[PDB]
C-alpha cells in the first residue's frame, strides 16, 4: 500500500518515534504500513498497532460523544452535519483496522494468544461501529462483533487458564458488548459472573504479580456487575 516503499524495520522504528512524539495518527499509519508488508507481528508489534489505533479511535469517539450530546440537547442542521462528519471519519478508521485484521492478521496469527488478541480487537472495533450505527446496518455489525468475540472466547477457554489477563480482558469487553450494545443484560451478567468465579478459583495458585494482574481485571468485571445488578 501507501507506505509500500518503506522498509518494514523503518516503519516500526518510526511508529516508536511517533509514539514518543504523541503523533498517534502517524503511529497508526506507520503500523498499518508494517502490517501490510504481510509478515506476522511480534507481541510488542501487535501492542504498537493496538495502542496507535486505540488512541486515534479514542479521540474520535470522545469527539463524537461531545457532538452527540450537543445534538441531543438542541433536540439548524450544523451540529448534526458535523457529528456525521466525525462519524464518517471514525467509521473509516474502524473499517481500516478491521481490514487489517481480516487481511490477514487473524488467519496468519501463529499462536493462541495472538489469535485471541486479534479476534478481541475485531469484536472491539465492530463494537465502536455499532455505537454510531443505526438500523439494519447496526444489526449486522452487532452480529459480526458477537461472532468475533465468541470465537475469541472459544479459543481462550481451550488454551488459556481462567486467570490469564488476556482471557479476562476479552470476557470484560464481551460482557460490556452484551450489556451496552447487544441489549442483552442477562448474557452480560452471566458471562461476567462466570468469568469472575472461574478466575477466583485459581487465585491461590498465583505469584504475587499475577494475582495483582488478575484481581485488577476481576475488579473491572466486578464494577460492571455492580452497575448491572
Amino acid at each position: 500500500g501507501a507506505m509500500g516503499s518503506m522498509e518494514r524495520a523503518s516503519l516500526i522504528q518510526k511508529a516508536k518515534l511517533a509514539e514518543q512524539a504523541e503523533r498517534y495518527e502517524d503511529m497508526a499509519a506507520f503500523m498499518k504500513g508494517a502490517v501490510e508488508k504481510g509478515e506476522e507481528l511480534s507481541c510488542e508489534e501487535r501492542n504498537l498497532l493496538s495502542v496507535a489505533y486505540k488512541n486515534v479511535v479514542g479521540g474520535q469517539r470522545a469527539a463524537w460523544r461531545v457532538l452527540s450530546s450537543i445534538e441531543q440537547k438542541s433536540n439548524g442542521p450544523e451540529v448534526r452535519e458535523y457529528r456525521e462528519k466525525v462519524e464518517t471519519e471514525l467509521q473509516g478508521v474502524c473499517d481500516t483496522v478491521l481490514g487489517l485484521l481480516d487481511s490477514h492478521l487473524i488467519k496468519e496469527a501463529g499462536d493462541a494468544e495472538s489469535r485471541v488478541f486479534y479476534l478481541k480487537m475485531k469484536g472491539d472495533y465492530y463494537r465502536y461501529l455499532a455505537e454510531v450505527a443505526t438500523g439494519d446496518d447496526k444489526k449486522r455489525i452487532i452480529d459480526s462483533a458477537r461472532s468475533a468475540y465468541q470465537e475469541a472466547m472459544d479459543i481462550s477457554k481451550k488454551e488459556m487458564p481462567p486467570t490469564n489477563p488476556i482471557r479476562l480482558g476479552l470476557a470484560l469487553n464481551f460482557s460490556v458488548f452484551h450489556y451496552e450494545i447487544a441489549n442483552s443484560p442477562e448474557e452480560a451478567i452471566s458471562l461476567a459472573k462466570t468469568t469472575f468465579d472461574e478466575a477466583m478459583a485459581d487465585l491461590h495458585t498465583l505469584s504475587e504479580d499475577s494475582y495483582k494482574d488478575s484481581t485488577l481485571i476481576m475488579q473491572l468485571l466486578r464494577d460492571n456487575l455492580t452497575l448491572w445488578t
Binding site: 480482558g169 470484560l172 469487553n173 450489556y179 481485571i217 473491572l220 464494577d223 460492571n224 452497575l227 448491572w228
Partner: peptide
C-alpha cells in the same frame, strides 16, 4: 459501561 483500559 467501561471496557478494558
Amino acid at each position: 459501561t467501561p471496557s478494558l483500559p
